[PDB]
Amino acid sequence: RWYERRKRALTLAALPRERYRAIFEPGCANGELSADLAERCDMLVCCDTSTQAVELARQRLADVPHARVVQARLPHQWPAGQFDLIVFSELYLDAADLHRLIDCALAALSPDGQLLACHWRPLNAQAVHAILAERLSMHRLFSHHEQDFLLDLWSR
């Protein structure tokens, strides 16, 4: 598990700011990252379609009273809120779907919001990050692309 452990150590260290008001992830499946983000913000929220991931996140995130877990039928159906950090980690299914997430991301970002993107690579992870690069029109502050995974931070 060394590799997975390093990808997380690297992900959390990639963040410029020590703490964040509101963090949000369009996914609850990445359970240990969520744990670790929790200790870096005043408010964590994760939203997922799958009811299994939601139920799990609900447990993993019990002794963490400032986290909140939401379920939605559609991936472009986000909760209310304005977030200064949005995190993208689980490879959706083609360019249009991804554009819609970025759209929701753009609406919800605080005037100084950052966006963190991190994917293993088995549309692939390389196109995911290229599409991000091209659509967000934000400064790329951090960037590490290796054979196993890609990692990027955008800011304003």
TrEMBL record:
It comes from Pseudomonas syringae pv. tomato (strain ATCC BAA-871 / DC3000). Disulfide bonds join C28-C46. GO terms for biological process: methylation; oligosaccharide biosynthetic process. GO terms for molecular function: S-adenosylmethionine-dependent methyltransferase activity. Keywords: Methyltransferase, Transferase. The keyword Methyltransferase applies. This is Methyltransferase, putative.
